[PDB]
Structure 1
């Protein structure tokens, strides 16, 4: 059995790796509560380090699901509410347009046209981050247009930490990751763990690791391994396995709020009906969904993302490419971590091939 699944994953991953020149890749699969890991290639082409289920990858915007779990905790402890105006949790923003923007709009990228990235002139400094939001003028009315945005959900995470009374980075290290049982998950990789930190590769195989930037922790900062990230996936498949406060914090992120095409937007997670064709799942994770605006169709009420559904999230840095997906009704979870930023369509292709069947 374990040899037949290894042959499936190997048939799913190996062609895509060679086709995209991916130096190293790690797959972690959860089925019926049983873990399975599959390692391919090299974490470092220079020093010949091989990929293992403990290899640390940059998961990029998959971090947004962790940020959402943090926000989920604040909501369950009644320190904030999704319809709260943004400037309520940051007095410096009072008098700016964020007096009429809800946290939900920020969490779900519908504030009114916040861009993908902070301007290059905005540095990792609170005052510059403050000034940026203070002078920002909307392109659209709130809650009408989705524009994938790090400033948007980054502010969402930053305000969640404020409502809790501590910085975002500290709350993650000392509460979230320990509460989720994650010891191989970091925002700032300890010096003792750097040996497990895979090298990233891009155009011309120039080495690429992520550097500092405004609200980087909230938007795309997590580094973890396939095994540790699968622990997180399992925690999403079985929130009851955690203490009550953190079970409710994960269930909070399993709530859909509006649709765009086949994709239902939750907190961090993006959901699809299952089964669904590969082309449609690829279309939902394609570049236009990240760089271009889209009108939304709001659901009459929060829709639980449970049952025959596929929750997922992509993640890309300059040198890494991750994809996470799980299916509640099937009790199946999947993690694909790679040290090259290769097309999301290819990430979904690997995941879809594996999911095909059982």
Structure 2
């Protein structure tokens, strides 16, 4: 292969490969896209029990990186006039009309500022019916819009609303509208029978294979599955939205707009945004316990940074994606085992700082 193929292989071998042994991770796929050329590295096993090696067809669970697709769907719906971000959920989910949650707008749900939604639903909320009841019974706490608390229920409700506004279930929004618009071929909410042989098992902390369908409203928060080639295409779309038809181009661009600031992090739709270059500490701070687990006061912005970069981490979901528009480069890491977020961020930082222009 080319000098570039070899260079990138060396950097990934040096920075990502050692994580497999360190965290006993069965399988990993790492991809780089630079100047619209894709570079794919595969390690280890898609399935331990089957001795099936990870390859370009291997479908991984994206975990929280799923939220980037929910964000894109929301951007799509907004730019087709199907929703306004100033709307409230009861406009679409009619059973929520004239309940307190109908005082929170869609942008606030998408960006985690309702003021009273935690990382997960309560343990007892297990079914679709129960999720609706939960939202009807909800009451505010922190001033709406003022505090960010990273939240699966919050973006789940956003996703449900987006689906309602497009008159189809969320899985169909992604599988029939958004994935095809992005040119993705093996990305799914529900992996079909024909692709099960390619679907990596996830592995818990005891090295046992786990496979569940998402909980109620779970799909918009953590329910997407994809391959490394598809994820590199998704990064390409984020790096070059102008090359795509207007409806999806406008959707992608919508996800890049910072909506508020928490210290050095700007919250966009799905994506976290930073002034570029971001220090390693800035990137690490974005995924600290303080930021991920606790409420933090937001500050309004009048402007985004002049030069930007974006990332998202995907807890058995070892996923990470990052891109830098100015350098026309991005990186994707997929694994089927938990790896601390800080290790993902550090490895990607080393690679992106070292790759030749």
Shorter-chain TM-score bucket reads: over 0.9
Query: What does 1:226-245 align with in structure 2 at a 5 Å threshold?
Result: 226-245=228-247
Structure 1 residue 19: deviation in Å? 1.7
Q: Is 2:124 the counterpart of 1:121?
A: yes
In structure 2, which of residues 324, 330, 333 is the aligned counterpart of residue 327 of structure 1?
A: 324
| 1:337 aligned residue | 334
| 2:225 aligned residue | 223
| 1:286 aligned residue | 288
Flag the 1:211–1:234 CA change in 2: closer, same or farther, 3 A. same
Q: Is 2:79 the counterpart of 1:76?
A: yes
Structure 1 residue ranges without an equivalent (≥5): none
Superposed CA deviations along residues 168-225 of structure 1, whole A, max 9, x for unmatched, are: 1111111111111111101000111011111221222121224330111111110001
| 2:255 aligned residue | 253
In structure 2, C-alpha distance between the alignment counterparts of 1:49 and 1:357, rounded to whole Å: 32
In structure 1, C-alpha distance between the alignment counterparts of 2:350 and 2:45, rounded to whole Å: 23
Superposed CA deviations along residues 244-296 of structure 1, whole A, max 9, x for unmatched, are: 11111111111001111211000000011222222321121233322111111
Structure 1 residue 313: deviation in Å? 0.7
TM-score, with structure 2 as normaliser: 0.95
In structure 1, C-alpha distance between the alignment counterparts of 2:82 and 2:7, rounded to whole Å: 48
Q: Give the CA RMSD over aligned residues.
A: 1.4
In structure 2, which of residues 297, 300, 305 is the aligned counterpart of residue 298 of structure 1?
A: 300
| 2:42 aligned residue | 39
Structure 1 residue 240: deviation in Å? 2.0
In structure 1, which of residues 336, 350, 357 is the aligned counterpart of residue 354 of structure 2?
A: 357
Structure 1 residue 130: deviation in Å? 1.3
Return structure 1 stretches of 4+ with deviation > 6 angstroms.
Answer: none
TM-score, with structure 1 as normaliser: 0.95
Flag the 1:308–1:18 CA change in 2: closer, same or farther, 3 A. farther
Q: Is 2:266 the counterpart of 1:276?
A: no
In structure 2, C-alpha distance between the alignment counterparts of 1:263 and 1:141, rounded to whole Å: 21
> Does the Cα contact within 8 Å between 2:101 and 2:139 map onto a contact in 1?
no
In structure 2, C-alpha distance between the alignment counterparts of 1:196 and 1:327, rounded to whole Å: 30
> Does the Cα contact within 8 Å between 1:314 and 1:322 map onto a contact in 2?
yes
Structure 2 residue ranges without an equivalent (≥5): none
> Does the Cα contact within 8 Å between 2:214 and 2:222 map onto a contact in 1?
no
Q: Is 2:310 the counterpart of 1:311?
A: yes
Structure 1 residue 112: deviation in Å? 1.1
Q: Is 2:113 the counterpart of 1:110?
A: yes
Structure 1 residue 120: deviation in Å? 2.1
In structure 2, C-alpha distance between the alignment counterparts of 1:99 and 1:194, rounded to whole Å: 40
In structure 2, which of residues 197, 200, 214 is the aligned counterpart of residue 198 of structure 1?
A: 200
Q: Matched residue pairs, number?
A: 352
In structure 2, C-alpha distance between the alignment counterparts of 1:172 and 1:116, rounded to whole Å: 23
Query: What does 1:128-147 align with in structure 2 at a 5 Å threshold?
Result: 128-147=130-149
Aligned residue for 1:298, secondary structure, equals coil
Aligned residue for 2:194, secondary structure, equals coil
> Does the Cα contact within 8 Å between 2:314 and 2:320 map onto a contact in 1?
yes
> Does the Cα contact within 8 Å between 2:101 and 2:140 map onto a contact in 1?
no
| 1:54 aligned residue | 57
Superposed CA deviations along residues 156-178 of structure 1, whole A, max 9, x for unmatched, are: 11111111222211111111111
> Does the Cα contact within 8 Å between 1:321 and 1:337 map onto a contact in 2?
yes
Q: Is 2:67 the counterpart of 1:67?
A: no
Query: What does 1:159-198 align with in structure 2 at a 5 Å threshold?
Result: 159-198=161-200
Structure 1 residue 134: deviation in Å? 0.6
| 2:97 aligned residue | 94
